[PDB]
Design a protein around this ligand. Structure first.
Ligand SMILES: N=C(N)NCCCCN
Ligand SMILES: N=C(N)NCCCCN
Ligand SMILES: N=C(N)NCCCCN
Lengths: 113, 46, 48, 113, 50, 113
């Protein structure tokens, strides 16, 4: 997940080493050579600013585009369940092709400005 | 401020990364590093 | 004397909630259960 | 989990959206139509008020009744291992019959007066 | 003095302790609970870090 | 995980009951009679104190010695991945022979001094 009301999506700040950062994340690890794995994160933003944003996570043995498409739909669904007016959805995705043992990771880090 | 005020997080940053590793944990650590958040303690939210 | 900086100290209340829900994906069902429980709009920090 | 000493079990407060709430919980997700899933949460409160309360969670493919019975006993056992006198055990449970994909969830949320 | 590390984000831990324990139990959670006690950290709320 | 820069390794202090303790841990539960299960934790300390330490965990169906060896190699690898000078590695391990249902647990608890 949940983006607090009036929080802003900004590029990753300079975080003190060892800081305890509340983070919503999705990850997947595979030891199968040649297997493509992906992780994605989406943040649904409300039209009503007094409401909170919704953060969804996704991971699976698929492509980056499929993962991003899936995670954005999940965020959409979250807003429909709440009956809230959706402003837009921000997202990020990554895919990895396992050489021997690999991990794909996507996250939404919450911090303080 | 001379008196610390309680507050909820006010920034959200989207990062992503991937990595190869000798074990599952080392691969995960590598992905965090590739994502630019490998040297902080992640408190997973649900 | 009225305590200050209470939120920076240890929590002093506990609330029991519960809920269930259907969902299009496991995460959406989980989100729905939280909503049905009354805590769908806050960040849960799992304690063990 | 652990309810801090002198903390009180109260109805859910009006929580600020996006708050980082320390929560002990149990959940179960099932995609088997017709299957009954349940989740329960219990808190054993000590007679000696200087001691802490014990929070236990349970989830499974059983009824609300069985889930609540199981979690109340788990809390009692926790006290038995510690050698602490029991005041009472408070709990709640929930059950859900899957239609397509469902989730049963129970939690103990820690917050502030 | 009490402190909620999730709220006091500006105050980082400056200490680290290694503990370990094991235990039998009637349920998985009760066994886990007993292992924490055997470890000496059984009556606190563990916020798992990753 | 990450041990904050300049943090000191100390024996576990007296913690207030109900305290919210940031902890990195590994645990494994088994209900197979006679099966040996182990959990281990390691903390890689840098030579340059302005850098942070790395905490690694491991659990498995093996001996206490193999668990500790594995967890120590993992911490070493994390420092090699960063290209940082490693001062030393502190570690702890525990093993449990299941009777009916047992749990092995190892952790690194971050606290204040
Ligand atoms: N770099 C991190 N924050 N984590 C990677 C290692 C995680 C061990 N619990
Ligand atoms: N609404 C919540 N706080 N959680 C449910 C969704 C969690 C997505 N990481
Ligand atoms: N007592 C503990 N700290 N842990 C055991 C119970 C964890 C899930 N409420």
């Amino acid at each position: 997940x949940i983006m607090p009301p009036e929080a802003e999506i900004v590029p990753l700040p300079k975080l003190p080493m060892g800081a305890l950062v509340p983070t919503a994340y999705g990850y997947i690890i595979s030891d199968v050579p040649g297997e493509t794995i992906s992780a994605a994160i989406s943040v649904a933003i409300p039209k009503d600013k007094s409401l909170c944003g919704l953060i969804m996570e996704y991971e699976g043995k698929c492509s980056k585009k499929e993962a991003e498409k899936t995670v954005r739909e999940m965020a959409k669904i979250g807003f429909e369940m709440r009956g809230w007016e959706l402003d837009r959805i921000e997202s990020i995705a990554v895919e990895h092709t396992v050489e021997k043992l690999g991990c794909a990771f996507a996250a939404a880090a919450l911090w303080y400005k | 401020p001379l008196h610390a005020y309680f507050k909820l997080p006010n920034t959200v940053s989207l990062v992503a990364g991937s990595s190869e590793g000798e074990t599952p944990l080392n691969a995960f650590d590598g992905a965090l590093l590739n994502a630019g958040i490998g040297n902080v303690n992640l408190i997973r939210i649900s």
